[PDB]
Chains A and B, each alone.
Chain A
Amino acid sequence: GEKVKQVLLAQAEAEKIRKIGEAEAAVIEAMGKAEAERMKLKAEAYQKYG
């Protein structure tokens, strides 16, 4: 009763870390692509400054 309980809840902790890790990776990736568009557009505009 102690063993099966501890094992089942340890799997829940591991499932949480994995799910949160994947969600975070998707956000970091998307945010990088958006930030790169700022850098590119800012550069393509600044390059024309008199």
Chain B
Amino acid sequence: VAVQEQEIARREKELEARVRKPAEAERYKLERLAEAEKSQLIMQAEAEAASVR
């Protein structure tokens, strides 16, 4: 029982590094990569619009 009372404190740290931290890193990646996709599409839109006018 004492061994598993320490297994709790274990998983609480392992899960932070295995489950939480990478999901949080993925969120930051997705956000700053989305700004780049948007930036390229607005610049491309302006180019196509200028080419038409």
Contact = CB atoms under 8 A, between A and B. Distances in A.
B42 interface: yes
Given A5-B30, A9-B41, A20 B52 contact: yes
B53 A12 contact: no
The interface residues of chain A, by DSSP majority, are classed as helix
The interface residues of chain B, by DSSP majority, are classed as helix
Interface stretch (B1-9, B11-19, B43-51): B43-51
Contacts of B52: 20, 23-24, 27
Sorting the interface of chain A by its residue count into under 10, 10 to 19, 20 to 34 or 35 or more gives: 10 to 19
Contacts of A12: 37-38, 41-42, 45
Nearest to A24: B52
